[model samples]
Target: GVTVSPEVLAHRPLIEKYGKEYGIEDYVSYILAIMQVESGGTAEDVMQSSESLGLPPNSLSTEESIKQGVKYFSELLTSAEQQGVDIDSVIQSYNYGGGFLNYVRSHGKKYTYELAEQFSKEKSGGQKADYPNPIAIPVNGGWRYNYGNQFYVQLVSQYLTDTSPTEFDDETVQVIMDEALKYEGFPYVFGGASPTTSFDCSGLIQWVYDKAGISLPRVAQDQYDATQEISMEEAQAGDLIFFHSTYNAGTYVTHVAIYLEGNRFYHAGDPIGYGDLSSRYWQDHLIGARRVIHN
Candidate 1:
């Protein structure tokens, strides 16, 4: 495994300061990681080449630059948290966009569980090698970053794993605040998961569980069937809530959400691409809940 640079650690104080000032507490890793991706771990990195950076890349004086970077991170964290995204995975999305949200899009999120052995282990770390269809795209100088990379095996091997329930408590709510705030203006594309368009329901949940350190099936129906059945009353905060409608009388389960602490939960529905548990349409059908990752 690669060692984290001391310079990276130095940003902790700035992140801590900004995090506190902005009301984001526990997920400082999120702040640092976003900064890392945005500026390539360079405090001096700013929008030097593009108008988006205002004047320069790391132009701190330019309120637009700092605000844009910070604002982008805020939306990422808040959107993911609001959508009940898993922690680590959602953090990864900050590198690019929410492409990870579509883990179960073309196939299943866990579709490659059985074929883990096909890919050879070339690197050793606290990361997982079981990403079903991990993409190794060459970015800069042949350096590769994996896409739709599920970290389940890494969570188990590393002990940095967090239970979904813990995420639903104090940690998740605060994390979501910034994440959702960062990408406020992003649009949703049916099969799009990047900067151009936004996430669909399954894409949202997929990223959320990745943050929580849990892996889930990609699509809604497969996800509904993937977990262990739990009685509605016994369903906890991190459990899954599902819904189905019959415009044609026999349409299968079509909607889903991640249950939260209060009566609240997160979902991607019509009119409001992302919303809380109080949605009338979501509450109307109200299918049973399920507990997948016990934590």
Candidate 2:
């Protein structure tokens, strides 16, 4: 029925105008997603963007907020592209500011919940604030005071419009499986997507699929959202296995990997190695599995 609430949808016109002015018209939806996450269009500062300008939070008019927000997002997108960080990282830096991009660039150039958690804790010196949101129930505890929302990207992605995927044969899935296995011994850098660049957990999956013309999202949870869900019993060789709470990102899908057989999977684990789903950690955090597809 209602994908975006009318409260948030009310600002779309200004969002589009500023979105174009900032040369990111294509991201209008993403901008609104930010609006939805920020204030749900209830506040005058619909985008809650004044802080980016060193002004007080929610201090701007609706038009002013959209303008600054879209403008800032444009700059962030450009910086992300220039630095070669993942889009999720770009979205995250929108909340944490450009320092995050620098941090991620120097530290593997990818976005992970672990990185986000660490960044917040360090920025706030381990300070905590009350968080009534459901996303924090995993910890059921403190919100890092003075730091931005740690789950911004994950929350924004929930409102994004996703493209569809095409089906593939089991044999091709096997090919995809074997292709990923080739990189099992590579090092697990936070942002590495290639053999030379090393491999993060999701980066490994993304690069492996890109090899077979099977496009995948750069983040683990997004990749999970991109595929069709199947039970573990239905999950076969070459399906994607997702695990949650690996670092607690306000979501249920954090880690992802390609399933092999008999509870085995190849993943980017601190130097990229094989994993057993039957093991303790994997068993405890197991979310589910998904099948690959192409748009």
Candidate 3:
């Protein structure tokens, strides 16, 4: 089961209230997740930007934030439903601003999974010689940055269906892993750090560990430095996994994930879920690993 903090859970009623008003009650989890990532479900003010933040901060008004945020999301959702854009693309549009919408409408294609694949192929090097779909788009380029739409839906789906219990060799670390897994389908907002709505790679890592009663630095490189570096052979479940330029496309620790048993790991990428590090793409991009919780 997903464990939500009382601090964040407190806003559920308000979320429900606004969601119901906008006929978006069905998407409460998604809206909540957005709130989580955007403002940490706070009553404070968060300023929306054309590019980045620090232009100014809104008053720390939770009610106003929820109301405004819900209204914007509601409009986005309604627009998406009308255009036949899937929720994932819609979610991606939420982050990409109006560019995504312009692309979908001008192309006159349903923003379906197949369409995503088509664009992805077009963006990557044409189709692979022997593969069905073309190569996946780079983490930042082809589609929405860091796979926002795909990640958003997945996080919500996981929140609803991932009910089975999990066990681990180290119970202490298990708590951290479980918390991270709970966000399996969350979106990858570039500067996001919320456990409620969306996350960037390091933001997700930070939020999960914070839930498990630990603290780490806010960004990927800093988090990498805070941990004990380990090789692929030595990594265990709950260890931190790093990738270079998965997004932002440069040599820096730009992505992070939770190492699970085997070669699989979990991260808030194109979509949050289990991934095999040994896959051709991941292996080719692999930078290193870190053990934050040593048993």
Candidate 4:
């Protein structure tokens, strides 16, 4: 049977309840991811919204938090889909705000990560100038021209699975899967490297692999490069599946997850849990796979 942290499982009922209430039950996973990214699934400030459903700042109980957060996302998704926004762009718009929607409408096409970055630079009033370096844009009264928006989408996509098998013994794969599952309900803290706090997608991957007697890089892009590239058809349990253009456009990989077989994978995103990689939302975004475990 699939296993997840108690904290993560605890939220599932609430998540499902609100999801169905809002007519977006199909997107329960995405909403859950947002909850993790927004407030680490704490009642302290559910969704971390400055204001949600017109509620005052930080004034929500756990119930209110989940309700408002899910409701707000349901509305957002509905609005975006009605406007013909692509799924990926629609996800980013959650953080980028209405301005992103405006940009998308003007272009009348799917918003690419490159376009989002370009818009970020434009809104920030300067060119990025630096490649492979993090840049932040303070425009529209918030941080937009940075990696966070795309990162959120990528992070959430990790738990959203289509899943795995490989050259390793069943014991080895079990150990690796077990290590990964230990942090199932952890918050999606960018750059987080520990279970006590939170974990980023690649951080979780690195930590799990390290526990399984393998050492990998700390970033998703590098991890993708370090492994032996494999076709999705040939992927085995314990292989690494990669997604591209999650934060930046082009072939740059931005997300990683551990395959578990049956089109499912385990990843850290909004209270880490299992996900479906072959789902429509993930299929287009999936770029390739890599095998890090040798027989």
Candidate 1 residue runs with Cα over 4 Å from true position? 1-185, 194-196, 246-251, 270-280
Flag regions of model 3 displaced more than 4 Å.
1-169, 249-251, 293-295
Which candidate number maximizes lDDT? 2
State the C-alpha lDDT per candidate: 0.50, 0.82, 0.65, 0.72
Ranking by lDDT: 2, 4, 3, 1
Worst 10 residues of 4 by lDDT: 133-142
Question: What clash count does candidate 4 reach?
Answer: 15
Cα lDDT tens digits, model 3, 1-295, are: 2554456677889888988898888877776555554555444653132122223446436676676666777777777777666666665565545456556766764455455544445544453332221122443333332232333333333333233223225775778777777777766677788865688778888888888777899988899888877777767778788888566735488778888868888887867677888898888778887877423
Residue 63 C-alpha lDDT in model 4: 77
Candidate 1 lDDT by residue in tens digits, 205-226: 6665666556787777778888
Task: Please provide the root mean square deviation of candidate 4 (C-alpha atoms, Å).
Answer: 18.5
TM values, all candidates: 0.36, 0.55, 0.41, 0.46
State the weakest 10-residue window (summed lDDT) of model 3: 46-55
**Model 3 Cα RMSD, 1 decimal:** 21.3
